[PDB]
Amino acid sequence: PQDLSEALKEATKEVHTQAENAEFMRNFQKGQVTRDGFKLVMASLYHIYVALEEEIERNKESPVFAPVYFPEELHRKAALEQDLAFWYGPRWQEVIPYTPAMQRYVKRLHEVGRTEPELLVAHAYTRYLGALSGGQVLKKIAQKALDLPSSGEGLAFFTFPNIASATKFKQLYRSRMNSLEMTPAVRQRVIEEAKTAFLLNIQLFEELQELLTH
């Protein structure tokens, strides 16, 4: 399509469904998520967002990313740190897993941020817009399956405190993406990078499912 935002949505519709169809995610949607499974997901998110946000900070002034730089509204690292301390305890940093599939994703994020910054928007799009769109759905399913105590911690990741209206912000974020100027060749690679992001997620889901079925 014309607008990059619409192009991305349309181009990733298929892989998004593939993600929804992933065995690990099928069970999650069926409400069959376990505490051990959720912990692995949260650990994965921590590594992914740490890498993504390190690269965003590196390229925040670049014309290829500046337009979609919203640190206060979107940063998730601090929220995940809070959540992991709850899920894995005070020594979470020493015990959280960092698996090969998580590493593959992190490696690509750093590769992009350091050598193909123009493609970082694809990763920011897939992570942030995804979390902002289906985050509520996924969160509701989680808490109603995890039967968490009432300790007031563990799911901060699912709440963006600095965004008053998700609908308003999503429109703003899409507008900024559409403001980005890139050659057709680059735009093609951004679209492809977005699909790659989903694929990295899917391979991660396959790995986590394998680790949990022993």
Question: What are the binding residues for heme b?
Answer: 9, 16, 125, 174
Name the residue with tokens 């409400």.
31
199 binds ligand HEM per the rule CB under 6 A: no
134 binds ligand HEM per the rule CB under 6 A: yes
Q: Within positions 10 to 29, which residues make up the interface with ligand HEM, using CB under 6 A?
A: 16, 19-20, 25, 28-29
Q: Give per-residue burial for 70-96: e unless 16+ CB within 10 Å, then b.
A: beebbbbbebbbebbebbbeeebeeeb
CA 189 from centre of chain: 19
**Measured CA distances, 32 to 15, 139, 141 (Å):** 22, 14, 10
CA 107 from centre of chain: 15
Stretch of residues binding ligand HEM (CB under 6 A), selected from 73-81, 126-134, 145-153, 160-168: 126-134
Q: How far is the CB of 152 from ligand HEM (least distance, A)?
A: 25
Nearer to ligand HEM, 138 or 186 (CB): 138
Q: How far is the CB of 136 from ligand HEM (least distance, A)?
A: 8
CB 167 within 8 A of CB 95: no
Q: How far is the CB of 20 from ligand HEM (least distance, A)?
A: 5
Contact string (CB under 6 A) for ligand HEM, positions 50-89, x = contact:
----------------------------------------
Nearer to ligand HEM, 117 or 135 (CB): 135
Candidates 103, 133, 162, 171: give the one binding ligand HEM (CB under 6 A): 133
Residues 132-139: contacts with CB under 8 Å, at least 24 apart: 132/160, 132/163, 132/166, 132/169, 132/170, 133/166, 133/170, 135/160, 138/28
Candidates 64, 84, 101, 197: give the one binding ligand HEM (CB under 6 A): 197
Comparing C-alpha atoms, which of 142, 182, 134 is closest to residue 9?
134
Candidates 129, 155, 163, 208: give the one binding ligand HEM (CB under 6 A): 129
Comparing C-alpha atoms, which of 196, 150, 189 is closest to residue 4?
189
Site size toward ligand HEM (CB under 6 A) is 19
Binding residues (CB under 6 A) for ligand HEM: these are 8-9, 16, 19-20, 25, 28-29, 125-126, 129-130, 133-134, 137-138, 197-198, 201
